[PDB]
Amino acid sequence: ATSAFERMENKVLDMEATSQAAGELAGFGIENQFAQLEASSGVEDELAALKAS
Amino acid sequence: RTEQRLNQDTQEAKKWEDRAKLALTNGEENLAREALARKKSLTDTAAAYQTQLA
């Protein structure tokens, strides 16, 4: 149980570091909208190729 | 940390429903009633973690 608490707190620190990295992009509109436009236009291009096929 | 604690309790509460179903197919009422009391108490700790997370 004691060594499992040390493993648990280490993985909780990874989840807090992951949340802090996600917050560095939260409300950062330029990178957030760039990633959204890249994903949206990639799906629309794949569907345009599927409609052409 | 409080969100992963909420996820751990809410999956454990579903594992106590699985234990309650297994007790009912075994026919052991005292184990089914203990599994209900585990769900009631663990859903209260889940609601405490959800309130802290809110």
From Swiss-Prot, chain A:
Disruption phenotype: Essential, it cannot be completely disrupted. Cells with very low levels of protein have no ordered thylakoids, are barely green and are non-photosynthetic. Required for thylakoid formation. It comes from the Bacteria. Belongs to the PspA/Vipp/IM30 family. The chain holds residues 164 to 216 of 267 of the full protein. It comes from Synechocystis sp. (strain ATCC 27184 / PCC 6803 / Kazusa). It is found in: Cell inner membrane. This is Membrane-associated protein Vipp1. The gene is vipp1. Disulfide bonds: none annotated.
